[PDB]
Symmetry: C3
Subunit: 336 residues, 3 copies
Amino acid sequence: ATAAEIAALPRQKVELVDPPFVHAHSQVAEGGPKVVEFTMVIEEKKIVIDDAGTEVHAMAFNGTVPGPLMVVHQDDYLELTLINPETNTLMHNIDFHAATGALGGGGLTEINPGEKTILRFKATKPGVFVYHCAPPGMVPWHVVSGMNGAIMVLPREGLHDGKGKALTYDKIYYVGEQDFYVPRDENGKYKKYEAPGDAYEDTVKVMRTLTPTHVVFNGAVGALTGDKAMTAAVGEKVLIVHSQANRDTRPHLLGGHGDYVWATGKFNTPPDVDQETWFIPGGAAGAAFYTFQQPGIYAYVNHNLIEAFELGAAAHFKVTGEWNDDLMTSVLAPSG
Amino acid sequence: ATAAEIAALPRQKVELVDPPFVHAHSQVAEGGPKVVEFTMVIEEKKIVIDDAGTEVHAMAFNGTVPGPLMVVHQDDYLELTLINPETNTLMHNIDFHAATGALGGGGLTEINPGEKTILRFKATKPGVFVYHCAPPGMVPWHVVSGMNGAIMVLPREGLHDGKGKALTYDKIYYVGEQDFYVPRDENGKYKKYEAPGDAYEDTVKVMRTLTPTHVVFNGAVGALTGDKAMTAAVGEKVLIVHSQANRDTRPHLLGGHGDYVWATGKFNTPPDVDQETWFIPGGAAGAAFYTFQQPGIYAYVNHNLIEAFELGAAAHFKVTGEWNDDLMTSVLAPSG
Amino acid sequence: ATAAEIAALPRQKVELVDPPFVHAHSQVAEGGPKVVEFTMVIEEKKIVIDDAGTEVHAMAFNGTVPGPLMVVHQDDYLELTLINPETNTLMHNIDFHAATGALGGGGLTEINPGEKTILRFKATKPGVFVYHCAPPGMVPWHVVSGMNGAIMVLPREGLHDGKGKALTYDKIYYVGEQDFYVPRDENGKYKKYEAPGDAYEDTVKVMRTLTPTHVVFNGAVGALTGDKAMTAAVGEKVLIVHSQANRDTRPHLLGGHGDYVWATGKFNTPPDVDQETWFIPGGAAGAAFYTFQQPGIYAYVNHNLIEAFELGAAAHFKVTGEWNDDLMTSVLAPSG
Ligand SMILES: O=N[O-]
Ligand SMILES: O=N[O-]
Ligand SMILES: O=N[O-]
Ligand SMILES: [Cu+2]
Ligand SMILES: [Cu+2]
Ligand SMILES: [Cu+2]
Ligand SMILES: [Cu+2]
Ligand SMILES: [Cu+2]
Ligand SMILES: [Cu+2]
C-alpha cells in the first residue's frame, strides 16, 4: 500500500518472555495490520550446559538460548531494535527466515559492540520461522553458540486444519533445540576458555566432525525436565513450536502424538496428521498441535534416542487429569 | 467405550510370524471392533550380524530383530501379553507409538526376568507405528540392541489413495532397519562379550559418535538376500512397511518406485506419489505401495549408498514375469 | 506401445550443456511423444575441489560433476548413448531413478573401457530424478567420486501448483550437491594419488565415517560464486533443481523462500509452499520455484551451516532491480 498508509499503521511495542513461554498475543488478529515492535539486547556470556559444569560462551539474543519467540500476524510488520552492548566483544546481526531481502536482514543489521540497529520487514508468509545471527565468514560459529530463535507469523484468521476447521490452542510452548560442539582435551575433559574467540579454532575442529557433543532444549541438558517440565491438563489443546537452526531433528511426544503437524512450519502447507514422530530439517522451525487425553508424565524428545538420552535432547510434560482406561489399561500388572 | 462394552467385544488370538513376513489379516476389517490378542516372549541372545562373525547381544521381541509386525484395524483394541523369561538378565518393557498414555505403555509394562504383563490399548489412529523397549535410564541401549518393531493399524475400510480410490495389495513385507554400534579393540577388530551388560560401557562410547558400525535389515548384513530375498511377480501390488526406531533412513527400490508412499506412515495424511526415494525419520515407520512392472532382481536400500553397500542396508526382491520392452530396452547392448 | 509404434515416433537429438545451466527445452510439450536422444562420454579425470588445491579423481558423466540435466516430457522415451572410452580404467553403467526395470538401467548398461551402449526407457512419471553410476560391488565409490546427475521429466502440460494453476519459470538452474570423502595424512593434509585405484582403500575408510570432508555444489567449493554466481532479476521466476545422490541436504535461499517446492521432486505430489528450508533425502532430486522480490546478493545453501560454510555447500545469486522498502527497510542503520 501507499507510503502514507504504511506510516499511518499503528505501532505497538511488545514485552518479550523467555522460552519456553511466549509473550502475549491473540491467535486471530485484532484490528488491521500493525508494526509490532520488539527490542532485544545481545548477551555474550558463559553458561553451563550439563551436570558436569561444561561451559559454552553463549551468544544470546535477549540473554537466552534459544532467543525468544516473537509472534505477529501475516502482513503485520516486525520492527526489531537490536542492541549489541559495548561489553560484548563480537560483531553480530540477525537473519529472519520469515523476511524477504538482504540475507533475511543480516546485511542491514551488522552491529559492533556499542551499536544498535532497527530493522523492519513485512511478515508476508504465515508460519513459524527460524531467525539467527549470521556474520559473514563466521555464520555457523555464532549459530552453534546459541544465537538463534524463531518467530511465528500467524494467519490473520488463526490456525486451521486441512479441511478449514479452526484449530485454537489453549497454550503454546517454544522448544528451541541446540547442537553444541564443545572442545575436549586429550583426557576427554571439556575445555574452558577465558574469552569467546579463544575457543574458535578448537570449536571449528569439533564442528567439522558434524557430531555435536551435546544436543539440548532451552540451552542445557534437563532444562525442560523435573520442576521445569512443561504442563497441560487432559482436554487441553497445546501448540509446540520447535526449531533447529543448524541441524535436523525429529520430535516425538512419548505417550502422545502430533494431531496436526505443520512439519515444514508453514501454515499454507496443510498439516500432516496423527503423527508419531515428525521431522524438522536444520535451518527450520515446525509446529505440532495436540489435545492431551491422558494424565501423567510425558517425555518430548528428538527421536534419535542417543541424541535424546545420551546427548540431552529430552524434555517432559506433566499432565493433570483423569486416566482413560478405554484408551489404555494394564489388564495384568507386571507379575511373576 | 465403557469397561462393560469392551468386555462384550469379540476377541481374536493372532499368531505372529517372523519378519519380513506378516501374520494373516484382512485389509478391510471383518466385522466390528475387536480385542486383538498377541503374545511375545522377549529373548536376550547373541546374533551374528556380518560375515566377519561380528556379534550383537540382541534384546529381541519374539526372538527376532525387528520384532514382528502386529496388524489391527482402527478402533480395535490391541492386547499384548509380554513375557520376560527368567533366563534373561534385564528388565524390559514396551512403548507403542500407536498408543495413548503412560509413555506408550512403557510405564505400565516394566517386567523383570521371570515376570509377564498384559497391556491393552485402543488403536485410535490409522497407520504404521514403531514400538520399542524403553527402560528408564537405558532407553537407547535397548533400542539399538534390536528391541524394536512396528505395528500397522489399517483403516477399517482398507487403504485408499489421495482421492479415495481403494488401494489393495497382493503382498505385504515388513523391513525393520537397525543401526548397530559394535565396539572395536585397538586393532580395529570387533569385540565379543559373554554377557549383555559386559558390553554396555563400550557400546555407549560408540553410540555417542552417532556413527553406526552397521546398518542392516532384519538383523544382519544380507539377511534379506538369497534364501531370504522377498518375492513378487509382474503385476503384483506390494506394500513395503519400513521402520527405524532410532535413526533416519531413506528407502529406495532400485529399478522401481514408491507409487504411493505414506512417508510419515500415517494413513490420514495423503500419500506422496511416484517417489524415487522416500524419507523416514528415526522413531517412525513408513509404508510404500508399488505395482511391479518388470521382472528381475531388485535391490531395496537405504539410499545413503555407503550405509547400503558398506554398512549393510540392502535387501533384494526377486520378481518373476515377462520383460516389458516399451518401458525399457537395450537398443545396443554393451559392445566395442 | 508396440515396437512398431515406438519406431514410428519422431526423434530429437539434444545437445547437453554443463551444469548449472540446462539445455534448451519447452516447458509445455511440443506435439506428441518423442524419442529424445542424448549422448554422454564418461571421463575419469582429476579435478580440484578447493582453493588449497585438493584433488579428487572424479568419474564424470559428460566430463562434469554433477553430470548434466537431461530434460524430457512425461511419456517421451529417453534414449541415451553412453560411452566408456578406452582411456578410462573402470567399468561404469547408469541407473536412472526415473526408469522402470533392470536396476534403473544399471543392469543393461555395464560397459568396460572401449565400449558403448544405448539404453531407451519410457519416462512414465513426472518429476526430477537422480541418475548415477552403480557398478555391482563398487556402488558408493563411483557415486561419491561424482558419478551422478539428474533428469527432469516435465508434465506434458508444463508445471502447475497444487490447485491446478500454471507455474511458468523464466530461468532454470540445476544445482548438483556432492559429498566428497578425501583421505588426509598424519598432518591432517589432504592426500593426492597418482591413479584413482591408489585412493580406494583410504577413501573407503573415510566413507565409513559417514562424515564428508567436502560438500559442494557444481563440483567444488565456491563453484557457483563470483563470475559464476547464478543470476536473476526482481520479478523473475526461477526454478532451482537440486540433487544429492548419496546424502541428505536441506536447501535454503538466504533472503528468499521456496514459493513452491516439490520437496520429493515428484510433480504429481502437490508442492509445499512458502518454504524457508526444504529437505531432499540422499538418493533424490527436488525442485523449488521462486519469484525474486528484492535485488542484491543471495546465498543458496545446504542449511546445516557447518556443511554450508565450513565444508563448501554455498552458492550465490546476483539479483538486479529496485529495492522494496515495504518488504524490508533499515529504519536505523548500525550506529552508536
Ligand atoms: O516414544 N519415545 O521413545
Ligand atoms: O538406485 N539405487 O541405488
Ligand atoms: O538463511 N541462511 O543462513
Ligand atoms: Cu552473533
Ligand atoms: Cu539461515
Ligand atoms: Cu529391553
Ligand atoms: Cu519412541
Ligand atoms: Cu562409474
Ligand atoms: Cu540409486
